[PDB]
Structures are given as structure tokens and as C-alpha cells.
Amino acid sequence: SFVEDYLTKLQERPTIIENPNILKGSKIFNAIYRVDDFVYIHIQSIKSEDGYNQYNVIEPPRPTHDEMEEIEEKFALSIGDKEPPEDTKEKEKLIRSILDKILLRMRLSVPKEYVIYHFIRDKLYTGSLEPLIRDPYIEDISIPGLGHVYIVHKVFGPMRTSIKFENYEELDNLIVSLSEKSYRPVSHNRPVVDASLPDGSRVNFVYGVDISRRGSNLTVRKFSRVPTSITQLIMFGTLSSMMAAYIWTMLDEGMNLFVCGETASGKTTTLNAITAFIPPNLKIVTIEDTPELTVPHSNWVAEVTRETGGEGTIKLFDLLKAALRQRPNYILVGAIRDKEGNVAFQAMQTGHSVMATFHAANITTLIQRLTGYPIEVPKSYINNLNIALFQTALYDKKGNLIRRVVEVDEIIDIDPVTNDVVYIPAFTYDSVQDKMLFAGKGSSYLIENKIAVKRGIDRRNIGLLYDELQMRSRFLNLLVEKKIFNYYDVWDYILRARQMGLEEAIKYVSNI
């Protein structure tokens, strides 16, 4: 076996372990754990001089270079005109079959199963990075330029791996090839690309020695295909159950809402979580530069922009215009920054609800940016946007990083004397006690001028609305208590609440 082989070259043998969690804290060890049937990891407790532990990937041996060239060329010669299917499984099925035909009649330097591993690894997956992708104990992967691949391991922290890139052009080719597999090719014109690998891991590419002077570089950040849910956000303290119940009520009624803040404040995460509040039987069109939103609704159009360096380039603006003809109930724009913002408000003015993330720390800044170049939403249409929430990163007393929705504003008007926004802060934040404050009872213009009127409830039975709100807050609190945190489970519980009512829903989930 390829593994046992490797061991025999060693000065002294490492102990086989199920996983590195046992090695935690320790520092006198020597171990090999299994990842795939094709990937074993050898971890060495002896630091390098620069304090890196060594992460050694054990893979089966590769065929010769000339063998590989012969195979690729034959593979290319077969089928070479036909395009492969889009479906990843059907694609791999086809490739393995074709490969099996070519190899059958060949005399290989290494076993067939090994040629197959490496061919598939390089052609369909992430090549020499694939073992790192497959190890669940890897958090982050970095190729900073020529040299080793560095990782952050959940047990050992930063480690130097046995994988090396010693050639500029080979490194360029890796970045080009991986970005193409991530559906968003780099180019010299647009050498910086954020995207996701097929497994869902986030990847950042920086292409070309003219920008990344030690060679093209990349960073992979692993993390769930399952998006963070609204119950997790409540448990984190990012928003209260009442705040979530409020948003839930508003999305039930088609309100337009922007999630605002600075970069990495968590805006996209919050937008994705609250999307689960959009009623299930509605049409959702998402428009993004790269996919991040994981919408659970069935009627979901997911559109992504494209840069070609010429004809065929499609921007958020173009997609948003097309959405006016796609009968969506909600349009979710990944981020609004340029003239697509103007079209977002056109969408609102034509009866489509909209959510987006936006870069602004407060309502004053949000309105200045919406109404100014290059967005130029006219002032009298600004109140089509109903709600702006503002989210920020902070440190607590201990120094731990936290993210908090620090204000939720209802947009009422722009005052003609003179050009200041009229708004109501429905929620605010006390940074000292780390608590969310509600305005609250009989403070919301949206509850008591839009929803109450639709309902159509009188100003003296308005308690009925605030009671439904307090109700939704209890149900959410209950989900948190019972540790219903998974995105799709939370979605199911929300749909369940739609389909038997709150009163019946709270009382159910109280049992477990």
C-alpha cells in the first residue's frame, strides 16, 4: 500500500490515530490520521525554526510526466469536440468511463487506481490542494506566492504543508484553472477575484506577478454550505428575538429592507438569515457578483454577473433591469453600490419587493449615498425603502469580536425643509450592557400606518398586532432554547408556523 511504503522511509514510525483531536494541547507526538482512502496525514510534533509544525500529505504515487501527457492527449482526442455535461456527478461518471477505456490498454508505471486518483484529482477537483480541501481539520489554506502551501489547522494552528509551488507559470496556471472551476475566471484586467470552490469554500484569487509580486496567490476559507440561521444570530446576540420577529412581520408584508454596515460587519450573513422569513410560495430573484445567498425557496432564480473584458459583460445593473420582467416577489441584490441602486428603486416603484446589503453606518449616510452620484435615487422615492438596519463589528470587554445590529430605522420621508430624512428608530443598542432596545409599543409607523391599515385594525385594537409580534418573538426564543440552529430546520419550523398558526406553533415546540 502507498501508505505503508511511505512509513518505511521514516527515521521512526508515527502512531496511527483516528483523528488529531487527541493530540490537542500535546506537543510530544508523531501521528498519521486518515482523510480519504487516498489521503493520510502525517503530523510532526517537532517545530521548524520558524515555529511551523509540519503537515505531511501522504498520497499514492503519480504516473510519469510522459504517461500523464499521453493520457491527457488521448482523453482530449477522444470526445474532443463534444462539450461535457454540467452536472458534476454525470461529468465525473463520463470522465471515469472514458478514462477506463484509455488505461485498459496501457502499461502504467504505477497501479491503475493511482493513475485514476491523480487524473480525476487534477481534472475535476482542486489538484494538489484537494487533500487539504478534504481534511475537515483544515480551516484555511494559503498559497502566498512561490513556496509551500500554508494552512491553519483546527488542532495545530498554522502549519507548513509538504505541497510546494516553485514555478511562477505553474502557479499562474493553478490560479487561472481554479478560478475557471469556480465559475469566475481571473484576467489581467480583473486580477482580483472572490468566488467559491465547488465544495462551497470561499476563495480569494490574486492573479499575475504584476500585482502579486511573489507569484499569483490564493486563500481558501472553509465553511458550511449551510448558511448561519436566524436562531444562531439571536443566540450570538447579533439581534434579539423581538428584532427578528419584527423583521419577520415586515417581510411577511412585502416591506423593502436594506442591511447596512461596513465591510465584514456581517451584512450578507444577516440578509441570508432573514430571507427565511419571506413566504415560501413566492418568487425570489437573487442578483450577485458571486453566489453567497443560499435561498431555501423553490421558486428561486439565482443570477450572477459576468466580466468578459468586452462584449458579453453583464453587470448587476443589467440583471436588475431584467428582473423587472421576471415577476419576482422579492429581488435580493447581493450588494448595492453603483447605478443598480437606481434600478432597485425602480423595482420598488413597479411593485417588486427588494432587499440588499449596502455600505453605510447610519441612516444619514445611507440617504446621502442613495441620493448622490452615482446612484441618484430621487428624494421623493426614498421612502419606498421601508427599513434600514445597521450592523457593526465591536469588541466586548474581554476583547472578543462580536457583531451587533445597532439600529433599525423606519424610513418615513425626506423633509422638504430641508432635505433631511424623516425616520423612526424602531430598535437601538446599548453597548455597555450589550442589549437591544425596542422603541417600542405604539412607536412603529410601519406597524401603525401600513400593517394596521391593511389588516385593517383600529388604533385601539393595535394591541393585536403587538401581540402577534410578541408571539413571533416567543416562538423564535423557543427554537433557540431547543437548539434548533440548522438553517433548513429553522426554515421548516417557520413554514410549520405558517401552516398551523403561531399559537399552535409555540405550544408545539414547547414540547421537546
Ligand X SMILES: Nc1ncnc2c1ncn2[C@@H]1O[C@H](COP(=O)(O)OP(=O)(O)O)[C@@H](O)[C@H]1O
Q: Which residues bind Mg ion (CB under 5 A)?
A: 268
Give the residue, chosen from 2, 29, 168, 466, that forms a contact with a copy of itself under the rule CB under 8 A.
168
Residue 215 interacts, among Mg ion, ligand X, a copy of itself, none and using kind-specific CB cut-offs from 5 to 8 Å, with none
Segments in 78-111 forming alpha helices (H): 88-104
Pairing mode of beta strands 401-415, 420-430: antiparallel
Binding mask 69-108 for a copy of itself (x = CB under 8 A): ----------------xxx---------------------
Give the residue, chosen from 4, 49, 66, 81, that forms a contact with a copy of itself under the rule CB under 8 A.
49
Tell me how far apart the alpha carbons of residues 402 and 411 are, in angstroms, rounded to a whole number. Answer: 27
Tell me how far apart the alpha carbons of residues 100 and 109 are, in angstroms, rounded to a whole number. Answer: 16
Which residue, chain included where needed, has cell 504543508? 161
> If binding is defined by CB under 6 A, does position 266 make contact with ligand X?
yes
What is the chain's alpha carbon radius of gyration, rounded to the nearest angstrom? Answer: 27
> If binding is defined by CB under 8 A, does position 413 make contact with a copy of itself?
no
> If binding is defined by CB under 6 A, does position 181 make contact with ligand X?
no
Question: Could you tell me the strand order of the sheet in which 53-58 lies?
Answer: 15-17, 30-34, 40-44, 53-58, 157-165, 147-153, 138-143, 217-221, 202-206, 192-196
The total of other beta-carbon atoms located within 10 Å of residue 427's CB is 25
Tell me how far apart the alpha carbons of residues 206 and 126 are, in angstroms, rounded to a whole number. Answer: 17
Q: How far is the CB of 261 from ligand X (least distance, A)?
A: 6
Tell me how far apart the alpha carbons of residues 371 and 348 are, in angstroms, rounded to a whole number. Answer: 15
Residue 306 contacts residue 313 (beta carbons within 8 Å): yes
Residue 236 interacts, among Mg ion, ligand X, a copy of itself, none and using kind-specific CB cut-offs from 5 to 8 Å, with ligand X
Tell me how far apart the alpha carbons of residues 476 and 407 are, in angstroms, rounded to a whole number. Answer: 20
* CA 147 distance to own-chain centroid: 29
Q: How far is the CB of 175 from a copy of itself (least distance, A)?
A: 27
Q: Specify the stretch interacting with ligand X by CB under 6 A; choose among 135-143, 183-191, 260-268, 459-467.
A: 260-268
> If binding is defined by CB under 6 A, does position 264 make contact with ligand X?
yes
Nearer Cβ to ligand X (405/478): 405
Give the residue, chosen from 124, 152, 393, 502, that forms a contact with a copy of itself under the rule CB under 8 A.
152
Considering only residues 321 through 350, tell me which ones interact with a copy of itself, judged by CB under 8 A: 326-327
Which residue, chain included where needed, has cell 502507498? 2
Considering only residues 209 through 228, tell me which ones interact with a copy of itself, judged by CB under 8 A: none
> If binding is defined by CB under 8 A, does position 299 make contact with a copy of itself?
yes
Residue 237 interacts, among a copy of itself, ligand X, Mg ion, none and using kind-specific CB cut-offs from 5 to 8 Å, with none
269 has binding-site annotation: yes
Nearer Cβ to Mg ion (39/257): 257
3-state DSSP assignment of residue 69: helix
CA angle 218, 223, 226 (to 5 degrees): 140
> If binding is defined by CB under 8 A, does position 237 make contact with a copy of itself?
no
Q: How far is the CB of 484 from ligand X (least distance, A)?
A: 17
> If binding is defined by CB under 6 A, does position 263 make contact with ligand X?
yes
CA angle 240, 245, 248 (to 5 degrees): 130
309 has binding-site annotation: no
Give the residue, chosen from 238, 275, 342, 477, that forms a contact with ligand X under the rule CB under 6 A.
238
Residue 307 contacts residue 187 (beta carbons within 8 Å): yes
Q: How far is the CB of 238 from ligand X (least distance, A)?
A: 4
> If binding is defined by CB under 8 A, does position 496 make contact with a copy of itself?
yes
> If binding is defined by CB under 6 A, does position 392 make contact with ligand X?
no
> If binding is defined by CB under 8 A, does position 254 make contact with a copy of itself?
no
Dihedral sign for Cα atoms in the order 132, 137, 140, 146: negative
238 has binding-site annotation: yes
222 has binding-site annotation: no
> If binding is defined by CB under 6 A, does position 268 make contact with ligand X?
yes
Tell me how far apart the alpha carbons of residues 283 and 393 are, in angstroms, rounded to a whole number. Answer: 32
Residue 320 contacts residue 328 (beta carbons within 8 Å): no
Give the residue, chosen from 14, 61, 147, 198, that forms a contact with a copy of itself under the rule CB under 8 A.
147
350 has binding-site annotation: no
Residue 329 contacts residue 282 (beta carbons within 8 Å): yes
264 has binding-site annotation: yes
C-alpha dihedral, 44 to 47 to 50 to 51, nearest 10° = 100
Q: Specify the stretch interacting with ligand X by CB under 6 A; choose among 192-200, 265-273, 348-356, 407-415.
A: 265-273
Binding residues for Mg(2+), by number, are: 268
Interacting residue ranges for a copy of itself, rule: CB under 8 A: 49-52, 85-87, 140, 142, 144-145, 147-148, 150, 152, 157-158, 160, 167-169, 279-283, 297-302, 326-327, 492, 495-496, 498-499
Interacting residue ranges for ligand X, rule: CB under 6 A: 233, 236, 238, 261, 263-269, 357, 403
